[model samples]
Target: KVFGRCELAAAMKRHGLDNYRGYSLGNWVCAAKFESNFNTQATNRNTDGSTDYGILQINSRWWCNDGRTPGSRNLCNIPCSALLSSDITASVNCAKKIVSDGNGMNAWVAWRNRCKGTDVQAWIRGCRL
Candidate 1:
């Protein structure tokens, strides 16, 4: 029941996002839902609209256009597909490094805790394979 590229792309679009890689689409979506309730255009207002968050709930203002930085243009400019890029993984991992010396698993754990809930199998229901 694994999703391919096309399937993942459609799912991303359905959920109001751009294309994403097949392998990581589900995991990304799960993370997004947990982070900001799947709001692609969501933003945390307290920062004077400086935080332009999206489905992945990435804070654009903090990580959008710095070149090779967490808010670099490479990762933030694109859509869901960025998550699939190795460059992005490196960037995200780098950000995690600044906080916990490379413990991005915290993000994953948080995502699992909120969206996964008590039904591990149910998480895949919304995913289109």
Candidate 2:
């Protein structure tokens, strides 16, 4: 289920993402808005023919591998297609693994370009979380 900003904020907070690896909810949401707009099924074809996965657009090259793809580290140990589900648990868990990899949300180009050093308060504005 795709979500609105407010709803996604509350959900992220419920997942304890507001402070995950010291990253802010606004940063996460801003990245989400640009990457997938809260659509869990989002994917983008990479120039290398690999696909980016889910709301976070995690790359399959080093993160996940659907059977169709040949190379991957499967750092998240999940099929790329699995991230494209209504259940965000897999997405969030894989994202946490990415952040915990020590590069932070910088692993996501969208976060760097869209959320870094910005006042993204509106991403969580009016959110009940």
Candidate 3:
């Protein structure tokens, strides 16, 4: 499912991603923008052969088990397919788990390069949140 910016933000905020693990809603919005462009079914396979799933692009190498990534940790304890659902609940929960693991939001390279240490309010601008 594809989401508009404010639509995605409202959805994610409803799922409790705002200020989750000290990462603001803007940070989450910015990460989602660069990660999957607010598309729930987005998937990417890395050159290293690991796959990323869903809107947040959770990695098969460490979070979701895709039955393909070698040595997958499955820290989110979910099948990779779960992240593809349009509901966004599972993806949001997994992302919180990722942040709670001490990795913070820097686990995503896009977040590191774009959202991290930047003024991200524009990500949520024009939204009534």
Candidate 4:
């Protein structure tokens, strides 16, 4: 599913992403826009032969298990496919774990490059949440 800015803001807010790891809903909305344009089925192959899955593009190398990435910690302990689902529970949980693991929001290059150190308030300007 491709979510509108407010749609994703409302969804992530409900899923516990607001102020998570000190990153506000605007941060998530901004990064997610760059990550996958809020498309639930988004996927990208990494240079290390691992894959990124779903809207947040959680990676297979360190987070989710794809039964292919060697030395995968599977820290999220979930199939990478789960991140592609419209439900987004696994994606949100795994993203939280990624941030808690000390990577911060910088774990995602898109976040670092596009959303970091910027005034992200515009990402959620009219969102009622």
Candidate 5:
């Protein structure tokens, strides 16, 4: 998907995601690892008639519009398609917007369920950036 975890971390660091919006690099990297396995085109259909898109799995409920979903908050003001790009600027930008509203990694359930309070250091260890 992104060659591997280290490459993905390097790319995120290059784009300034290591410490975006005051969130730790580990939080971002671990979220991505669990959310999409580093695949930019990842998508997961939620049981509640919604879907998550991209590496960060920006949700249709509050972040982006997937077109199939109606009445989305679209707070990030980006199309779901943009999140699927490996470039990831759109995803990063949207993620910042999400955390801007007093929410941190909670925006991503995968992070909360798995990576939160866990040893996130391993997520970016090999990147060496």
Candidate 6:
């Protein structure tokens, strides 16, 4: 299912994300699909004390003070726990920022390269945006 734009925008604002419209939600979805099959409650155990959680599998233990709370500080100003809350778009945007600040397209490229499997290069080439 496609996520609503208005819902995404509102979610972005709730997490203090700017330039929400500029972000490519489709690309974020693609990355999430590749990473965790779009499972919003997904979590992964990491040896570094950081646990990856939510759709983008955000590493909250190391990235934020509040394990699953909003507004905690991490690599980006937003907390990783916030991504697990109701604001999924904000979470995706936060992940986008972690991957690429102003250039999300580059972030997509990197995700396609690093996280994607053997079909990564071919999938990227096939993608329109």
Residues 1-129, model 2: lDDT tens digits:
676787777778877778788477787789888888788877778787766668877676767766566666787787666666666667777787777778677777887886777777876777788
Candidate 5 residue pairs that clash: none
Candidates 1 and 6 compared: the better one by lDDT is: 6
| Whole-model lDDT per candidate | 0.41, 0.75, 0.79, 0.79, 0.76, 0.51
Q: TM per model?
A: 0.42, 0.86, 0.86, 0.88, 0.85, 0.50
Query: Candidate 5: lDDT over CA atoms?
Result: 0.76
Which of the two, 1 or 6, has more TM-score? 6
Against the true structure, candidate 5 reaches a TM-score of 0.85
Local error of candidate 2 at residue 41 (angstroms): 1.1
Name the 10 consecutive residues with the lowest summed lDDT in model 5: 1-10
TM-score of 4: 0.88
Encode model 4's per-residue lDDT on 3-112: one tens digit a residue. 67887889888988888874777877888889998888888887777677778887778788887767888888876676666767788888877777776677788888
Clashing pairs in 3: none
Candidate 3: lDDT of 20? Answer: 82
lDDT of 5 by residue, 1-129 (tens): 453677777777777766677577788888888888877888788778777777888776777777677788777788777666566788878887767676688878889888877887877766667
Question: Candidate 1: deviation at residue 65, Å?
Answer: 2.9
Superposition error at 71 for model 5 (Å): 1.7
Off by over 4 Å in 6: 1-26, 67-73, 79-81, 101-129
Residue 17's lDDT in candidate 4: 81
Across residues 2-84, which tens digit of lDDT does each residue of candidate 6 receive? 23334433443454434344444444444555555555667767566556676666656534455454544566445555555
